[PDB]
Amino acid sequence: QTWYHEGPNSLKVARLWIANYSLPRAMKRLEEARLHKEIPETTRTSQMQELHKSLRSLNNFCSQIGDDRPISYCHFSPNSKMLATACWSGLCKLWSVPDCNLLHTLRGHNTNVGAIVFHPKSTVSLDPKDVNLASCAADGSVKLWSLDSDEPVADIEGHTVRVARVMWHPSGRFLGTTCYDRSWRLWDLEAQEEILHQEGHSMGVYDIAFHQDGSLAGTGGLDAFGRVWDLRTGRCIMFLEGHLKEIYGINFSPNGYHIATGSGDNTCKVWDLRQRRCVYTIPAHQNLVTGVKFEPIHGNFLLTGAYDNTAKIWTHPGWSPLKTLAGHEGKVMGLDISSDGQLIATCSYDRTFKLWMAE
Amino acid sequence: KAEVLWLMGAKSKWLAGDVPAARSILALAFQANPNSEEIWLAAVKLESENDEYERARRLLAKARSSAPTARVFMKSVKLEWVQDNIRAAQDLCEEALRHYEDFPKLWMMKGQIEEQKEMMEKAREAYNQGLKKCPHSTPLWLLLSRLEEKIGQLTRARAILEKSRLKNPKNPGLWLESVRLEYRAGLKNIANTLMAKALQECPNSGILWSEAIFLEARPQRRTKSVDALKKCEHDPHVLLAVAKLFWSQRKITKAREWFHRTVKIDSDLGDAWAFFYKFELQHGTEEQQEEVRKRCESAEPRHGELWCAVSKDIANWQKKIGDILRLVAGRI
Amino acid sequence: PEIEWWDSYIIFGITNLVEHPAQLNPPGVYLTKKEQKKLRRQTRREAQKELQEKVRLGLMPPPEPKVISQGVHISVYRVRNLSNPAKKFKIEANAGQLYLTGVVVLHKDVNVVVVEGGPKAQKKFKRLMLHRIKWDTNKCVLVWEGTAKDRSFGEMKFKQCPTENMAREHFKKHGAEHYWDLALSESVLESTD
Amino acid sequence: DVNPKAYPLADAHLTKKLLDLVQQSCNYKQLRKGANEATKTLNRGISEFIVMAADAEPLEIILHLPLLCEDKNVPYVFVRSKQALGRACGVSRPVIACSVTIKEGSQLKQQIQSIQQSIERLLV
């Protein structure tokens, strides 16, 4: 019963914009991968072994009290010099890396805050007093923030129930949102109005991820089923199943091959998009996996965190237990990897966030 | 088959006042050596108690000739550091480290001397190595955490304490250190939360309850004291905390009674004696002060949080019990 | 590869339509003392009345004077050595009695036990395996504990394998080789310390 | 449907388990009824977990309890009806908050631990 519905033409022009922005990026990605994969074998083995040893040699520091209430999300700015943390209070904070010094606390949220995400060009090509950050709350509310205001700017009022996650499209022109209406919306920044209201999930949607080249969008809902929509034409192309409990995390890989999902059944599933088949199932943790994060541009390892008090780093491919990051006295509610890959951040229910680095 | 009888006889002779008899017995036992290296330690202690510290140095040389465990190297380094340049003590510590890694007391002493001298980074490295090799040493973790906090960078100290708590885990010392680390900063509610967790996973811990009692507000202390008494009764720390609470409320007779109870329960706690002495001098006649002095001098205590803080600093190491008590009582 | 199947598909099927595709579904009060008393009293009174009326109608003589569905919990342990026959019998008997499906695979220093069933049975078996059995370096640890959509073996069976590849392929036959991979890697890392 | 502010809301199955465990605790003398007594147990540190009703009329009269539980590291859940909670507590009036306390060597320890683990997974 794939009952369609005609929407606005703004949606069509935005789809064409996405298509002609994404296609050349995809071709460049394939060309780069083909060029790289044809280098001598010993060099690749040695470099990967050195990377594995460095990952094994990871140490914790700057364990900072982020707030008086549990910390719900942590993100790294482009250039990996600021860390944006959300709290179960109405407060969001920005810290300098790696000294972890508070910069211009943000205010405006009244309920528990969910995810807070920097713009893809926040600290590289955007003036501070423009739109730089986006955040969502436990009640239906989404707010945009700048780096020199401490107060929000033009909000979004298209949601009436809890908003689970917010993500920036790699181009930066569009902002994704997942609501508890069993749907997810796409908000256009230049047009400044919602352009797509996708409903394909049985229950409320929780997590959203965007493909690097801006072609696909992965969505994980509370129904243990995930979708892979094509932003060019909608038309969900891959319905992936195999989890029995809710999916709380989803993340694409720098290469267009793999997707990773975490669910409440304590497992982390690695799917291959070029085979439309689940390729691996990692028994990661002894509790629900909150978030799974592929490594940045290189994409050579996987990072997971669960409601047990540890996170874990696994090889990719191979999915071997490279390292376990312990120390937290509470549930790990979120984690992130610096775009340079030399720093990891993990927030916790213990009101603290820790930074892991190679010694 | 064992020198237990010899040790008992030596203690009895020392308790009888006969100096020449005990000294001759110790010298004969050391010469014949029908026991372990304890003969050398007793000789060194007597020489320190003998005419002068020159006798202690002679006994140290005699022990070095007898060559007991590397703890002899620790004693030699300590004697050098007492009055000398850091060169000789550092050389002795390095020789001991080459000889043995654990005992961790060698690393502790090395780091403490390193802080005693110009810079602290080398002390941090020494503590890091000692913890990496021991590795289950609460005092080494405490020394490293205190060093890091004293420099600054409270976040690194918090991370170190978190790692120490993870490694053991579940010992009251690290929990108390973390609570105090959070308290010393402007974070009191975080300290209270850590206190709640520590008491959750270490319910029958006297020191944790003692800290918790005074982490409360004035009107919320009686119930907490009652709970501490119910959970860990006959614990010297809780009795001392109750006596301090009574003293703080001007109920001096009950404070004196509970101080008497605390001393009668555990006489090997330095803090209780100092608190009793200060309470007596602030409240009571002078014969009460002298009586407290005599009771404390009858039984020498140790294992105090701040009593061992003076009985270990190299400045007053060789000072005796009365001056140590006065020093501790004067720091509150 | 040169193009991914989605990129090949697009190059045009684009128009302002939003999809709603293929909906797929996922995979008492207590009584008080007074009420209790009232109920018993009423029941017994009704019984007595019916018996009396039965007597009054001659049917009886007058009395004489008295003179895993919807989700299966899985757990995975590993033991150093498990060659003891009595302990193997204990494991098998308890697993069968608690209706715990799964397998035991013995190996050099890595004897992996996989059990599957319900939560209460899983807790009972975990208590047995971690507290009741006295292993004494011969230790027992819990490798993993989670849930899956459906069972994956039939019943306990003490398979023997002296080659790691044989154990891995045996596990793969069912489709559960990830447990063996995790247990083996954890064993290597344990051995390297 | 109930209230957005009663965030960790249990479902029918977990609700049934929670009410049964509360009844058993009442039978074992390990239960305290009322927001005031729950607060007292939290302050004394003798609380296993806290159950609150999501239909309190203002609902701000028991929103200090989640904060207290976070401070003292205790799990907490919300049920839908205070009448059911009061019935499970052993009284005929509605009850909006109750606490299961700690008893040494009680036979309910395993069920309490299982319920704690189940509750702690609801905070996502």
From Swiss-Prot, chain A:
Positions of WD repeats: 66-105, 108-155, 158-197, 200-239, 242-281, 284-324, 327-358
GO cellular component: Cajal body; nuclear speck; nucleoplasm; nucleus; spliceosomal complex; spliceosomal snRNP complex; U2-type precatalytic spliceosome; U4/U6 snRNP
GO MF terms held by the record: U4 snRNA binding; U6 snRNA binding
Main location: nucleus
Impact after mutating R29H: In RP70; does not affect nuclear speck localization; disrupts interaction with PRPF3; does not affect interaction with PPIH; does not integrated in spliceosomal snRNP complex
Subunit structure: Component of the precatalytic spliceosome (spliceosome B complex). Component of the U4/U6-U5 tri-snRNP complex, a building block of the precatalytic spliceosome (spliceosome B complex). The U4/U6-U5 tri-snRNP complex is composed of the U4, U6 and U5 snRNAs and at least PRPF3, PRPF4, PRPF6, PRPF8, PRPF31, SNRNP200, TXNL4A, SNRNP40, SNRPB, SNRPD1, SNRPD2, SNRPD3, SNRPE, SNRPF, SNRPG, DDX23, CD2BP2, PPIH, SNU13, EFTUD2, SART1 and USP39, plus LSM2, LSM3, LSM4, LSM5, LSM6, LSM7 and LSM8. Interacts directly with PRPF18, PPIH and PRPF3.
Protein name: U4/U6 small nuclear ribonucleoprotein Prp4
Provenance organism: Homo sapiens
Protein's gene: PRPF4
Residues of the full protein shown: 164 to 522 of 522
From Swiss-Prot, chain B:
Tissue-specificity statement: Widely expressed.
Subcellular location: Nucleus, Nucleoplasm; Nucleus speckle
PTM section of the record: Phosphorylated by PRP4K during spliceosome assembly.
Domain of life of the native organism: Eukaryota
Repeat positions for HAT: 17-49, 84-116, 118-150, 250-282
Disease cited in the entry: Retinitis pigmentosa 60: A retinal dystrophy belonging to the group of pigmentary retinopathies. Retinitis pigmentosa is characterized by retinal pigment deposits visible on fundus examination and primary loss of rod photoreceptor cells followed by secondary loss of cone photoreceptors. Patients typically have night vision blindness and loss of midperipheral visual field. As their condition progresses, they lose their far peripheral visual field and eventually central vision as well.
Function as written in the Swiss-Prot or TrEMBL entry: Involved in pre-mRNA splicing as component of the U4/U6-U5 tri-snRNP complex, one of the building blocks of the spliceosome. Enhances dihydrotestosterone-induced transactivation activity of AR, as well as dexamethasone-induced transactivation activity of NR3C1, but does not affect estrogen-induced transactivation.
Protein name (Swiss-Prot/TrEMBL): Pre-mRNA-processing factor 6
Natural source organism: Homo sapiens (Human)
UniProtKB/Swiss-Prot annotation, chain C:
Location of this chain's protein in the cell: Nucleus; Nucleus speckle
GO CC, alphabetical: Cajal body; cytosol; nuclear speck; nucleoplasm; nucleus; spliceosomal complex; U2-type precatalytic spliceosome; U4/U6 x U5 tri-snRNP complex
Major place of residence: nucleus
GO terms, molecular function: identical protein binding; RNA binding
Entry annotated with the keyword Nuclease: no
Disulfide bridge positions per record: none
Keywords annotated in UniProt: Disease variant, Isopeptide bond, mRNA processing, mRNA splicing, Nucleus, Phosphoprotein, Retinitis pigmentosa, Spliceosome, Ubl conjugation
Clinical condition linked: Retinitis pigmentosa 18: A retinal dystrophy belonging to the group of pigmentary retinopathies. Retinitis pigmentosa is characterized by retinal pigment deposits visible on fundus examination and primary loss of rod photoreceptor cells followed by secondary loss of cone photoreceptors. Patients typically have night vision blindness and loss of midperipheral visual field. As their condition progresses, they lose their far peripheral visual field and eventually central vision as well.
Function: Plays a role in pre-mRNA splicing as component of the U4/U6-U5 tri-snRNP complex that is involved in spliceosome assembly, and as component of the precatalytic spliceosome (spliceosome B complex).
Protein's name in the database: U4/U6 small nuclear ribonucleoprotein Prp3
Species: Homo sapiens (Human)
Shown residues within the full chain: 385 to 683 of 683
Curated annotation (Swiss-Prot), chain D:
GO cellular component: box C/D methylation guide snoRNP complex; dense fibrillar component; nucleolus; nucleoplasm; nucleus; precatalytic spliceosome; protein-containing complex; small-subunit processome
Molecular function per GO: ATPase binding; box C/D sno(s)RNA binding; RNA binding; U3 snoRNA binding; U4 snRNA binding; U4atac snRNA binding
Chief location bin: nucleus
Record-linked Gene3D superfamilies: 3.30.1330.30
GO biological process, any: ribosomal small subunit biogenesis
Chain residue ranges for the region called Interaction with U4 snRNA and U4atac snRNA: 32-44
Reported impact of A53F: Abolishes U4 snRNA-binding
Tissue localization of expression: Ubiquitous.
Subcellular location: Nucleus; Nucleus, Nucleolus
PTM-bearing positions, type Phosphoserine: S118
Domain of life assignment: Eukaryota
Keywords assigned by UniProt, alphabetized: Acetylation, mRNA processing, mRNA splicing, Nucleus, Phosphoprotein, Ribonucleoprotein, RNA-binding, Spliceosome
Effect recorded for G34K: Abolishes U4 snRNA-binding
SUPFAM superfamilies: L30e-like (SSF55315)
Region ranges (Important for U4 snRNA-binding): 92-124
Residues of the site described as Interaction with U4 snRNA and U4atac snRNA: E57, K82
Modified residues annotated as N6-acetyllysine in this record: K17
Family per similarity comment: Belongs to the eukaryotic ribosomal protein eL8 family.
Assembly notes: Identified in the spliceosome B complex. Component of the U4/U6-U5 tri-snRNP complex composed of the U4, U6 and U5 snRNAs and at least PRPF3, PRPF4, PRPF6, PRPF8, PRPF31, SNRNP200, TXNL4A, WDR57, SNRNP40, DDX23, CD2BP2, PPIH, NHP2L1, EFTUD2, SART1 and USP39. Interacts with RAD17 and PRPF31. The complex formed by SNU13 and PRPF31 binds U4 snRNA. The complex formed by SNU13 and PRPF31 also binds U4atac snRNA, a characteristic component of specific, less abundant spliceosomal complexes.
Name of protein: NHP2-like protein 1
Provenance organism: Homo sapiens (Human)
Lineage: Eukaryota, Metazoa, Chordata, Craniata, Vertebrata
